Design a protein around this ligand. Sequence first.
Ligand SMILES: CC(C)(COP(=O)(O)OP(=O)(O)OC[C@H]1O[C@@H](n2cnc3c(N)ncnc32)[C@H](O)[C@@H]1OP(=O)(O)O)[C@@H](O)C(=O)NCCC(=O)NCCS
Ligand SMILES: CC(=O)NCCc1ccc(O)c(O)c1
Length: 210
Amino acid sequence: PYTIELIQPEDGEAVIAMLKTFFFKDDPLNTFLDLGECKELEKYSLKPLPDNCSYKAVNKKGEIIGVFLNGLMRRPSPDDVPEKAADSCEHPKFKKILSLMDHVEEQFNIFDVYPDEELILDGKILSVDTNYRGLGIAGRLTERAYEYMRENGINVYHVLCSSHYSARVMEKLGFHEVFRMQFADYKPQGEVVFKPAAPHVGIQVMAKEV
Ligand SMILES: CC(C)(COP(=O)(O)OP(=O)(O)OC[C@H]1O[C@@H](n2cnc3c(N)ncnc32)[C@H](O)[C@@H]1OP(=O)(O)O)[C@@H](O)C(=O)NCCC(=O)NCCS
Ligand SMILES: CC(=O)NCCc1ccc(O)c(O)c1
């Protein structure tokens, strides 16, 4: 028995405490790198909260057992000056993750897929407590966002997945692949950076039109 609720500003510390226990340790990229203490990822996770479309799953004791942090994403302006997120990151391990994100964006622009859309919902951080996995919480978190999308005329939900394992969860929820890149093919300076276990494969960007 759990609720799905909007994450409030006062929830920031509790959200971070939960992510530090789970996501920071068990997202496949974070585990591969042994991310450790990472204030940059705390900052990254807190950023979308004021967009008022991030959700927490909360158990009967009032503990956060899952989150899906989402932010609105806008089509680059005609006069856009594109920036690399990695350039302002001092944490060397998190810089590798941000560099991977920058690389994906250099190769693939979600706004090219949907030329008529100005605003898209971006699913940024998805994490469920281990003891509550396999119960459909990820799906219930995701589907709460559809409510927000309906209320605001947003058609597209975009979610970059860090493993085929989580891309499959999104597929079950009605998302489809829009871009993929194998870890074995990600060689920004000529050499492989990420080498997690074979079943992870690589990143897949997933999208749903609601
Ligand atoms: C990805 C994640 C959020 C999924 O959350 P979830 O609420 O467990 O999602 P689901 O209930 O749909 O379960 C997904 C699959 O996990 C498997 N599963 C079943 N029981 C499980 C358990 N006790 N523990 C882990 N996985 C389990 C099943 O394959 C299940 O699919 P199915 O129920 O359709 O057969 C969760 O695994 C997680 O936090 N992973 C680590 C962080 C991460 O990778 N986040 C996503 C980044 S894109
Ligand atoms: C939908 C989702 O949770 N995507 C995760 C992408 C990501 C973000 C930050 C990290 O540190 C990381 O390993 C992976």
